[PDB]
Amino acid sequence: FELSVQDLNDLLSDGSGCYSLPSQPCNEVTPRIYVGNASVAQDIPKLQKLGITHVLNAAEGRSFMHVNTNANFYKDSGITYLGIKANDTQEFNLSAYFERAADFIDQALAQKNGRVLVHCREGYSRSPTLVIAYLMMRQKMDVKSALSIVRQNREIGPNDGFLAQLCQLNDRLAKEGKLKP
Template identity: 35%
Template structure:
């Protein structure tokens, strides 16, 4: 487990006021259409944007970017690709940008990459081609778990910083499903270790007892001894 994952897991629950502030985001930003071609900081050290934002070395360096998650449709591999592999550390995910694509299966690898980068003082840009549906879905799932938000609040939080995002219907369904998944993982992780050990010991004891019973059953004769059932006088003539 990386240091960032520990921090995420132990992050204190936000007060209602803090939650509203986080979700609402900066209120002094006036969204302009051309900002679709730029990247925006969603939470400290995590940026979201389109592929075009990853093509400017000057911009990336001015933002202090150290790691880039390049998410692309497999058909776009010839054009949407790492541009500065010698300068930044990349993670490239080839997916299908359609409603049937399973993002939840791919998300843990991306989450670990982002966690490790930020834990080591890095700054991460997550992008797809347009920065509208595919990469925002990953970022929504990340901030959902980071701040332990509902899927609606996580979606609004990202939208309030990058107004143009719009995950497709299939991705939105998976975002909703991920809320139950991350909450279940937190519940399991927070369950007292002593209780887990006691439960394992009880299962082990029960298994041992079952095995002893099975061995005892095998030792019992399947047919009673002839002397136990036979009437000694049965064969005598009356």
């Protein structure tokens, strides 16, 4: 997958072999789907003002790379929570969660007033991966179009492992039917 991952990295990068970091805490990357960092996830009044009804913590844990929230944190806030304890490493199998995460996103967007925040620590690798996979799975986009639309609305940089996993998902979805360019 190396050179296919290299292609996706070429779509993300700034032309100096480097990658831009997010310019804001949170962005609406496609209608009613927000990707953001830990600071927005931990700010319930801010979530409520934004109209966030569902929060997917893709970095649930306790370390410099995690966000130590849980269902209890959101108890009686009106916000429905799902946590995934993913690590932001090339060897973490985030693809094992693509269906679960896509189902959660679908559950939020099925409600016409629903808005979902998918976040990690920085809103840069784990959380965008899950949104990209959702776009591929539930809107039939190929990986390059899905990655491109998210990156147009937030500086992201899925790690190379996650990119390979998205390439593998693209392959799996392409066995069902054609994917939209």
